[PDB]
Design a protein around this ligand. Structure first.
Ligand SMILES: CCCOc1ccc(NC(=O)CN2CCN(C)CC2)cc1-c1nc(CC)c(CC)c(=O)[nH]1
Ligand SMILES: [Mg+2]
Ligand SMILES: [Zn+2]
Length: 290
């Protein structure tokens, strides 16, 4: 054991309301690394994952520290904080968005692990789905490392089922796969044909839900979104006048239809769509000022 694992395993885990991780407007700028690790423990706990799958506390703590360490801090956006924010949005969509009741325990377990792991070992956008296969491979290696096996409490049937959902969920964060598959998702939604009891449409929904959380910074309050866009711009160009229009085009081409479709599935996910619309106004106003 290191000093980090000792102090994290011995610390008090505040409640979900104290940590504000149920809010879609959650922000991590004021949190330390230890504090984000505590938020992650609370996410597993309040989703009943520690209870239903008999996770040892020090194993989960070791797993979280392994995932965090296998992100690169020198990468401006695709780092541990992006993975942590993606998982927080997944938690909020499950809790506040009331999506948790539409899914099974194994699907929730896999979505949370996938959200935290979907960009492992990312080197930056400057440095198919070749990358997402590497991300899942990093996730699988951590899940099998000694002392980090948070899935040990599962039977082989549950374990094999969970690994497949994790793999599909991480591969789904490839925007090319999202663009190829979202046409079917919007077809069913606009035809009042969408049904989650269908295994094919359920897996499609899990893919869209991964992308919605992956891009959720675009939905944040304007002071926060402006800060995240600064990180994205740093990674895109360094590792300004055209950024406002680029964001508007990104919101129109990618984000708006997704968060509108997600609101159709769950009305309580509307805060994501509403924050995305407000950010489009702010960016469009700046684009016209150039
Ligand atoms: C802030 C600096 C500029 O960021 C961007 C610039 C351009 C694009 N365009 C596209 O991705 C694809 N375009 C192709 C041309 N099409 C007409 C429209 C769609 C996206 C971003 C962007 N990507 C992410 C995710 C990493 C985030 C984080 C949520 C973000 O905030 N902005
Ligand atoms: Mg990625
Ligand atoms: Zn990502």
């Amino acid at each position: 054991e290191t000093r980090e694992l000792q102090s994290l395993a011995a610390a008090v885990v505040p409640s979900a309301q104290t940590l504000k991780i149920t809010d879609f407007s959650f922000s991590d700028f004021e949190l330390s690394d230890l504090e984000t690790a505590l938020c992650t423990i609370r996410m597993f706990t309040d989703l009943n994952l520690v209870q239903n799958f008999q996770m040892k506390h020090e194993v989960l703590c070791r797993w979280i520290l392994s995932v965090k360490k296998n992100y690169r801090k020198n990468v401006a956006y695709h780092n541990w904080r992006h993975a942590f924010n993606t998982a927080q949005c997944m938690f909020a969509a499950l809790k506040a968005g009331k999506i948790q009741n539409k899914l099974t325990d194994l699907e929730i377990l896999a979505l949370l692990i996938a959200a935290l792991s979907h960009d492992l070992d990312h080197r930056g956008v400057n440095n198919h789905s070749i990358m997402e296969h590497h991300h899942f491979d990093q996730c699988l290696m951590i899940l099998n490392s000694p002392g980090n096996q948070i899935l040990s409490g599962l039977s082989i049937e549950e374990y094999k089922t969970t690994l497949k959902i994790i793999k599909q969920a991480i591969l789904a964060t490839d925007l090319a796969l999202y663009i190829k598959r979202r046409g079917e998702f919007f077809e069913l939604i606009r035809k009042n044909q969408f049904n989650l009891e269908d295994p094919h449409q359920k897996e499609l929904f899990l893919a869209m839900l991964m992308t919605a959380c992956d891009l959720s910074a675009i939905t944040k309050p304007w002071p926060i979104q402006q800060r995240i866009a600064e990180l994205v711009a740093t990674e895109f160009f360094d590792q300004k006048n055209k950024i406002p229009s680029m964001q508007v085009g990104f919101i129109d081409a990618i984000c708006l239809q997704l968060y509108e479709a997600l609101t159709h599935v769950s009305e309580d996910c509307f805060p994501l769509l509403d924050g995305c619309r407000k950010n489009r106004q702010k960016w469009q106003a700046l684009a016209e000022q150039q």
